[PDB]
């Protein structure tokens, strides 16, 4: 009963991106995977605009924040806005991104695939490592599905792509619905688009019914 968990505000942001920044881009492998090894700003204002749906949740200690989560609702249109933004944004850094983010969409499709018309969909999940043994990541997670339940979201979605994620969403029942292998992930020119550095091997998506 230490940690306070709150919905982030449209208002308080900076700090919200100030955190992420420190403990969420420098591990991510889409980020590391890919040369300009610095996230682009639309990147970190494409997490941000999901704060607005009230979907977005940090974990406060002390007042400091300790953990956050972005997530956002998405429907059956999400794979054309991702393919449209792919092609907006070749071939920077933040196209590399969108572009096998776009495929796993596209592969995943969720609510067509599930016959669902909505899904909560987890952008980022980042956790201060310094307080082991606060539940941080099961917390937000539980949290956002609990706010996926009072919105009557019927599906919550997540593309894991690190150990830790892959094992917190296994062990709170997520089922495991797509497997993309960054090797096996190319170009339109045959190039592999993010290449993130050991022990990265795939994006793992995840579901869990609500």
Same mark, same amino acid.
């Given at each position: 009963?230490?940690?306070?968990?709150?919905?982030?505000?449209?208002?308080?942001?900076?700090?919200?991106?100030?955190?992420?920044?420190?403990?969420?881009?420098?591990?991510?492998?889409?980020?590391?995977?890919?040369?300009? $090894?610095?996230?682009?700003?639309?990147?970190?204002?494409?997490?941000?605009?999901?704060?607005?749906?009230?979907?977005?949740?940090?974990?406060?200690?002390?007042?400091?924040?300790?953990?956050?989560?972005?997530?956002?609702?998405?429907?059956?249109?999400?794979?054309?806005?991702?393919?449209?933004?792919?092609?907006?944004?070749? /071939?920077?850094?933040?196209?590399?991104?969108?572009?096998?983010?776009?495929?796993?969409?596209?592969?995943?499709?969720?609510?067509?695939?599930?016959?669902? $018309?909505?899904?909560?969909?987890?952008?980022?999940?980042?956790?201060? $490592?310094?307080?082991? /043994?606060?539940?941080? /990541?099961?917390?937000?997670?539980?949290?956002?599905?609990?706010?996926?339940?009072?919105?009557?979201?019927?599906?919550?979605?997540?593309?894991?792509?690190?150990?830790?994620?892959?094992?917190?969403?296994?062990?709170? /029942?997520?089922?495991?619905?797509?497997?993309?292998?960054?090797?096996?992930?190319?170009?339109?020119?045959?190039?592999?688009?993010?290449?993130? $550095?050991?022990?990265?091997?795939?994006?793992?998506?995840?579901?869990?019914?609500?």
């Amino acid at each position: 009963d230490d940690i306070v968990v709150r919905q982030v505000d449209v208002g308080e942001t900076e700090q919200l991106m100030t955190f992420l920044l420190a403990h969420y881009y420098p591990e991510e492998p889409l980020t590391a995977g890919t040369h300009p $090894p610095e996230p682009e700003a639309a990147d970190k204002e494409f997490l941000l605009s999901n704060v607005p749906f009230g979907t977005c949740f940090v974990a406060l200690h002390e007042g400091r924040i300790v953990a956050a989560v972005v997530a956002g609702p998405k429907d059956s249109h999400e794979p054309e806005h991702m393919a449209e933004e792919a092609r907006k944004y070749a /071939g920077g850094k933040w196209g590399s991104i969108l572009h096998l983010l776009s495929a796993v969409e596209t592969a995943t499709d969720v609510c067509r695939r599930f016959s669902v $018309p909505s899904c909560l969909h987890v952008h980022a999940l980042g956790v201060d $490592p310094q307080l082991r /043994g606060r539940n941080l /990541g099961g917390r937000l997670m539980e949290t956002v599905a609990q706010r996926g339940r009072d919105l009557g979201h019927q599906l919550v979605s997540v593309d894991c792509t690190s150990v830790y994620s892959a094992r917190l969403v296994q062990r709170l /029942g997520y089922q495991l619905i797509n497997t993309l292998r960054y090797v096996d992930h190319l170009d339109a020119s045959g190039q592999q688009v993010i290449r993130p $550095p050991p022990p990265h091997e795939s994006v793992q998506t995840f579901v869990l019914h609500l």
